[PDB]
Amino acid sequence: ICTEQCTLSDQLLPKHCAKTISQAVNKEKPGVESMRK
Amino acid sequence: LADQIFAYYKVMAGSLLLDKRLRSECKNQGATIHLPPSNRYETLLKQRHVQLLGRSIDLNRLITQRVSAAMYKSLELAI
Amino acid sequence: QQTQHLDSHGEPTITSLYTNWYLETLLRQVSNGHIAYFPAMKAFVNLPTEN
Ligand SMILES: [Cl-]
């Protein structure tokens, strides 16, 4: 469970926003995994 | 002077705390987040008695008045 | 116990591990001329050397 959560926390780190930065400069989402159908 | 002095140190703060890995990743994607150009305000900030037209001006005191007002506006904005 | 040089079992802690790394790796490479202290960035930064 800790391993699973550590993964979820790692996905919140700033490093993962690089794409979002670039796509806006010259032109999923944490929480989706918790959206239960 | 006060205006650019506050902006200079606000940018410095935001730059000092910006994640390093994110910087490198933005660089590798041709979207480099540019570093703040260094400046030289320290000597101006140290001026306690500027001789002008007979008056003795405390430049430090005047700047502090503006910079202090800038700090409060920043905090007021964030909230 | 992780704040000590050794835990209650005489095993290395993160304190001992990091202490060794910062000295034998990071600071050592500063002396080798590959890294420099940037007071501007409040951090040690890699230099563009042949390393
Ligand atoms: Cl510069």
From Swiss-Prot, chain A:
Expressed in which tissues: Expressed in all tissues examined except peripheral blood leukocytes, with highest expression in brain, heart, and skeletal muscle. Expressed in cells of various brain regions including Purkinje cells and dentate nucleus of the cerebellum, CA4 region and dentate gyrus of the hippocampus, and in frontal gray and white matter.
Source taxon at top rank: Eukaryota
Subcellular location: Cell membrane; Cell projection, Lamellipodium membrane
Family: Belongs to the HEM-1/HEM-2 family.
Chain's role: Part of the WAVE complex that regulates lamellipodia formation. The WAVE complex regulates actin filament reorganization via its interaction with the Arp2/3 complex. Actin remodeling activity is regulated by RAC1. As component of the WAVE1 complex, required for BDNF-NTRK2 endocytic trafficking and signaling from early endosomes.
Subunit and partners: Component of the WAVE1 complex composed of ABI2, CYFIP1 or CYFIP2, BRK1, NCKAP1 and WASF1/WAVE1. Within the complex, a heterodimer containing NCKAP1 and CYFIP1 interacts with a heterotrimer formed by WAVE1, ABI2 and BRK1. Component of the WAVE2 complex composed of ABI1, CYFIP1/SRA1, NCKAP1/NAP1 and WASF2/WAVE2. CYFIP2 binds to activated RAC1 which causes the complex to dissociate, releasing activated WASF1. The complex can also be activated by NCK1. Associates preferentially with the first SH3 domain of NCK. Interacts with NYAP1, NYAP2 and MYO16. Interacts with TMEM132D.
Protein name per Swiss-Prot or TrEMBL: Nck-associated protein 1
Encoding gene, per UniProt annotation: NCKAP1
Residues of the full protein shown: 617 to 667 of 1128
Swiss-Prot record, chain B:
Protein source organism: Homo sapiens
Cystine residue pairs: none
Residues of the whole record sequence present: 706 to 784 of 1253
Role played: Component of the CYFIP1-EIF4E-FMR1 complex which binds to the mRNA cap and mediates translational repression. In the CYFIP1-EIF4E-FMR1 complex this subunit is an adapter between EIF4E and FMR1. Promotes the translation repression activity of FMR1 in brain probably by mediating its association with EIF4E and mRNA. Regulates formation of membrane ruffles and lamellipodia. Plays a role in axon outgrowth. Binds to F-actin but not to RNA. Part of the WAVE complex that regulates actin filament reorganization via its interaction with the Arp2/3 complex.
Membrane-crossing segments per the record: none
Location(s), subcellular: Cytoplasm; Cytoplasm, Perinuclear region; Cell projection, Lamellipodium; Cell projection, Ruffle
Name assigned to this protein: Cytoplasmic FMR1-interacting protein 1
Other remarks in the entry: Breakpoint hotspot for the Prader-Willi/Angelman syndromes and may be implicated in autism. Commonly altered in tumors.
UniProt family annotation: Belongs to the CYFIP family.
Chain's gene name: CYFIP1
